[PDB]
Structure formats: structure tokens, C-alpha cells
Amino acid sequence: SQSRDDFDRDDVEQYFNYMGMLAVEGTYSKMEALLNLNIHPVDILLMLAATEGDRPKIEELLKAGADYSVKDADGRTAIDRANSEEIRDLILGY
Amino acid sequence: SQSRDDFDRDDVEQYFNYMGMLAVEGTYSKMEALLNLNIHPVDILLMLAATEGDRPKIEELLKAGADYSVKDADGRTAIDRANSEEIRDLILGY
């Protein structure tokens, strides 16, 4: 009941913005779950920085004493969240 | 140097927002470039829905004639953008 030309530039931008909205709501929810567990913000930041493969932030947080064994709301750690083997080993190799 | 208690709730919130902004800004710009590259909107929508693993959207778009062999700016298709084997096979098995 629909053809290729029934989709235009506005349909692409609208889907982008809608999914962008759901992404902000979902990632905000994840943040509050972390803060609502009594995890120190510095360990929470490492969990995020690990997810993002953010090497400079990872190095900064470890130097300040971030603990990479702390478990999140899924029972998973910054090592689990590390988005690559190299990120995993940067964290382990500090 | 820095310490563990130098990081607070506001740091957690600011880091999520900073990373969320970078994500949005990168994907928004890539999306707009694809549009200006006169790739058909329905094919761009399949690329985005594949990235999202949005099964109802993918099925709607494929019924409408969306083409999963079209390549984006990185040479990649909706098949490549799929986040899992289940979504890959959903697209291929239509």
C-alpha cells in the first residue's frame, strides 16, 4: 500500500529526529539508573568513557582512581563495556 | 593531579550530554550529506532503520520498494549498518 516515491526528504529528517528523541530518553534513563545505584560518579564516568572508547577520558579517570570492577545495573563493569579489545587493555594495563 | 571525589553528579550529566551531542552532530551531518548526494529518501530511511534495528520500519520500507544494496558515504549498505544477524536476515529474507 506504499511506493518508493511516497518517501521524501522530510520523511528522512523526521525519522532521524524521532529516533534521536528516543535515543536521548534511553540514554538519560541509563544515566539515572547508574546514579540511582549508589555508584560514585567517577566510576560511572569510567563506565561511560569505556562504552565510548574515549581513551583520554579513560586515562584521566584512572589517574584519579576510577575502579573498573564496579558493576552497573546489568551487573557489568567498565571492562565489559569497553567497546574494543584495545580499550579493554588500556583499562587493564593501567 | 585529580582525586576520585573531584567528580560529581553534574560531571556524569555533562559527560552524557557532551557525548550525546557529538553523536547527534555526526549522524545528523552524515544524514544531510546523503540527502544532498541525491540518494533516494526511501533508501536512506532503510539505512537509518537498519542502524536502529527498527523491525516494523524496515518491513514497511522494504514493502515500499527500498533497496538494501545502495551504499552510503562510507561505501556501506543497510545490510552493513544492521546491528545484528537477526536484522541482517530480516532484510535479506524479505
Swiss-Prot record, chains A, B:
GO biological process terms, semicolon-separated: granum assembly; intracellular protein transport
Localization per record: Plastid, Chloroplast thylakoid membrane; Plastid, Chloroplast envelope; Plastid, Chloroplast stroma
ANK repeats: 41-73
GO cellular component, one term: chloroplast
Source species, domain of life: Eukaryota
Tissue expression summary: Highly expressed in leaves and seedlings. Detected in roots, but not in germinating seeds.
Swiss-Prot/TrEMBL induction comment: Up-regulated by light.
Subunit structure: Interacts with CAO/cpSRP43, but is not a component of the transit complex. Interacts with LHCP (via T14 domain), TIC40 and TIC110.
Protein name listed in UniProt: Protein LHCP TRANSLOCATION DEFECT
UniProt organism field: Arabidopsis thaliana
